Amino acid sequence: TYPEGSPVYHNGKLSVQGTQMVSECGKPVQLRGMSSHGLAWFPKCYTEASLTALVKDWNIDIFRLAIYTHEWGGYTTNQWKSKDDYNAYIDNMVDICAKLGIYCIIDWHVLNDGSGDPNYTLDDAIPFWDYMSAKHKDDKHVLYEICNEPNGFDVKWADVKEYAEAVIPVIRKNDPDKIIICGTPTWSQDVDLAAQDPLSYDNVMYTLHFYSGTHTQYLRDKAQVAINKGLALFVTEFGTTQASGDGGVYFDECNTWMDWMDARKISWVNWSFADKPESSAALKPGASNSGDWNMVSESGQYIKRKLSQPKSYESCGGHHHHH
């Protein structure tokens, strides 16, 4: 039972129709929300209290759990939690999102230390995704992001497609209808190359990542090629900075990206909800010590203001029933 008036109450189980993500009543939906930073790095930032503030005060529709596979404390490392205990932690966060009625992305966050080819994480990715899809089959509010940012010159769409064709059957044997979001080459830029040979599965979307200090028209044009060839795109990560996550903020270029996404009804998730002293972090340093989840940085202020706009969906109605 999702809480009255919440994003999941309004839209129910989402699916993909052509290039558009739609609600349980078949209406186009654009979701807006926030990504975690590394969970092992900022655990004080990801609690019932902090997510309650994100929902009630920042008006988010969706939260993304960035589960690093590598670097210190990554899922594959057994440096912070055992793999099965990390699963239990993730499950707790998924349940908090359910209690608040927001969507939750489980993100297998490949990036560095060789994980740039997601195939090189399969010894852990297969049992991870087997577990998560079995555990969360009956959870209407989860989305499965199977490989954050494939990268490397050696990592082509053919290689990412082979990874996806290994993991998606493992998910779909347990959870037939849940949306799967598939990363693309060159740090989830090459959606136009994925569009040349798309996956044959239903309810699949393709990842686009941008950073407004780095990516401009060229990447929007690549994305438009993918859209014109019939792919549904999801911006599961973007920043207001250059791609490193620090330095200047570029709000004029981000406004261009926001207008562009709005016109195409493309969902977006901002990097990051954390109080690291870098300019892409949405909280001021020390906010996790004080517990003041509205003590925003310059970037957080800008994103919270975008989140405060009218919802980019229309309720499925039937408010006279519990959902």
Numbering used by the authors: 48 to 370
Sentences from the paper on this structure:
Here, we report a detailed characterization of AGa, an uncultured Bacteroidetes-affiliated genotype that is predicted to be cellulolytic, albeit via an unknown mechanism. Taking meta-omics and enzymology analyses into consideration, we propose a non-classical cellulose degradation mechanism that involves the utilization of multi-modular enzymes that are secreted via the Bacteroidetes-specific T9SS. All five GH5 domains in this cluster were affiliated to GH5 subfamily 2, the largest of the GH5 subfamilies.
Comparing specific activities revealed Cel5D and the individual N-terminal GH5 domain in Cel5C (Cel5C_N) as the most active. Similar to the relative activities on CMC, Cel5C_N and Cel5D were the most active, releasing mostly cellobiose and some glucose from Avicel. In comparison, Cel5C_N generated ~ 800 μM of cellobiose from 1% Avicel in 24 h. Cel5C_N and Cel5D were too active to show the stepwise degradation of Glc(5) or Glc(6) in the assayed time points, degrading both substrates to completion in 30 s. Both enzymes produced Glc(2) and Glc(3) from Glc(5), whereas Glc(6) was converted to a mixture dominated by Glc(2) but also containing Glc(3). The inability of the otherwise highly active Cel5C_N to degrade decorated hemicellulose substrates (e.g. xyloglucan) was supported by structural characterization studies, which resolved the structure of Cel5C_N to 1.57 Å.
